[PDB]
Each structure stands twice: as structure tokens, then as C-alpha cells.
């Protein structure tokens, strides 16, 4: 016989709501990337997105240890020659706090079209509310 493979048509996906208040950033993010990848399912398949849709709320109340709130630095580059930019953690939290979770998970996900498809299922919200009540999402504690 041959080893089973999941099929993207017959695969079922579920919805989960995670509250990110007070939780450690990376220890949250690796469980999110685990469940977006689908490595908690027996029908895991590397080339198939078998993960679950995840709504993350209270993203602005995520916690880091140490002095990383003032010392963790998010660099990027605009393409232009001087265009190195820089923002700290608490600046990113005040300015645009969803990016912190998005960046950590994007770094823990695979690189490619499938990893970008896994990232499309991550839906973060700074507040405590969402418009996705129509999908009947279950709660999940991480």
C-alpha cells in the first residue's frame, strides 16, 4: 500500500479563539504555528495546509520577559539605500501592535506559498472582539 496523504478538498478546518493577554510571545507563537501547520493532526501532510483558523485577540497585552519591551528591536529596510528603519517593541505596540504576533508567527512558519497560505488563517486583533462570530469559533487556551 501507500502512505496516506491529505487532500485539500476533503480536509476540515476549525476555528479557534485565543486571548493573548499576559502570555509570552514566542511560547504562544510556536503553538499557533503548530496549529496553523497542522502538526497536531494525524492527517498532517507537509505539502497540504491542514491547520486551523485562529483568531488572536488582545494582542496589545502580550508580554515579553526581561528588558525586551524596551530593548527588542524590529529592523527593516525600505529598499532605498539609507532605508534601514528601526522600531522597538513598545513602539510597535503603540503604533501597530498586530505586527508583533504576525512577525513572530511568520518567522516560525515555512517559507513559500504554503507558508503564506498558513499565515492567511491567522487573524489577530488588538481588542477583545471580532466580526467572525459567524464561523462559530471555539475557545482555545494556549
Partner 1 sequence: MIGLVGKKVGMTRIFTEDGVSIPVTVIEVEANRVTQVKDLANDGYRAIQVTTGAKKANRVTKPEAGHFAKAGVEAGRGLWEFRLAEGEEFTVGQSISVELFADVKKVDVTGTSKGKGFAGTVKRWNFRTQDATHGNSLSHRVPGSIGQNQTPGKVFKGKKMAGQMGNERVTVQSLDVVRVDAERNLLLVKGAVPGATGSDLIVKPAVKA
Partner RNA sequence: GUGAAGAGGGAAACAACCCAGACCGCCAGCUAAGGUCCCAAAGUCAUGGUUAAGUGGGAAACGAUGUGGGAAGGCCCAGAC
Partner RNA sequence: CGAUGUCGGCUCAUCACAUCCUGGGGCUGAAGUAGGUCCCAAGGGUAUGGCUGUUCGCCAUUUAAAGUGGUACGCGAGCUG
Partner RNA sequence: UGCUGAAAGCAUCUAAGCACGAAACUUGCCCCGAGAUGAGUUCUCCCUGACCCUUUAAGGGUCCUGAAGGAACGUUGAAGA
Per CB under 8 A, residues contacting partner 1 are 79-81, 83
User: Please, what is the Cα angle at 131 between 126 and 134, to 5 degrees?
Assistant: 140
CB of 14 to RNA, least distance (A): 19
Written as nine digits, the cell of 131 is 466580526
Among 22, 66, 79, 127, binds RNA (CB under 7 A): 66
* 132 interacts with RNA by CB under 7 A: no
The sign of the CA dihedral 114, 120, 126, 130 is negative
* 134 interacts with RNA by CB under 7 A: no
Dist CA 97 CA 93 (whole Å): 4
Total Cβ atoms within 10 A of residue 56: 26
Binding interface with RNA (CB under 7 A): 1-3, 26-27, 30-31, 33-34, 37, 39, 46, 65-68, 71-72, 81-82, 85-86, 95, 98, 102, 107-111, 116, 120, 124
Amino acid at each position: 500500500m501507500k502512505t496516506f496523504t491529505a487532500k485539500p478538498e476533503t480536509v476540515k478546518r476549525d476555528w479557534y479563539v485565543v486571548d493573548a493577554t499576559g502570555k509570552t510571545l514566542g511560547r504562544l507563537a510556536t503553538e499557533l504555528a503548530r496549529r496553523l501547520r497542522g502538526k497536531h493532526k494525524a492527517e498532517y501532510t507537509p505539502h497540504v495546509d491542514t491547520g486551523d483558523y485562529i483568531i488572536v485577540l488582545n494582542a496589545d497585552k502580550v508580554a515579553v520577559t526581561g528588558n525586551k519591551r524596551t530593548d527588542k528591536v524590529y529592523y527593516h529596510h525600505t529598499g532605498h539605500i539609507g532605508g534601514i528603519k528601526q522600531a522597538t517593541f513598545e513602539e510597535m505596540i503603540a503604533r501597530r501592535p498586530e505586527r508583533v504576533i504576525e512577525i513572530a508567527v511568520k518567522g516560525m512558519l515555512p517559507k513559500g506559498p504554503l507558508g503564506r497560505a498558513m499565515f492567511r488563517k491567522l487573524k489577530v486583533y488588538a481588542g477583545n472582539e471580532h466580526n467572525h462570530a459567524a464561523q462559530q469559533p471555539q475557545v482555545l487556551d494556549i
